[PDB]
Amino acid sequence: SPRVCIRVCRNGVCYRRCWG
Amino acid sequence: SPRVCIRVCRNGVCYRRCWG
């Protein structure tokens, strides 16, 4: 199946977000 | 330093793209 996620990092802090 | 990347998957094929 398809997948949609994004990775971002700021001031050292990192986190990932997905939709669906 | 900051980072900006995204992960997507379609028809099984997957790939990641970044900007900067």
TrEMBL record, chains A, B:
Signal sequence range: none
Gene source species: Capitella teleta
Disulphide bond pairs: 5-18, 9-14
Record-given protein name: BRICHOS domain-containing protein
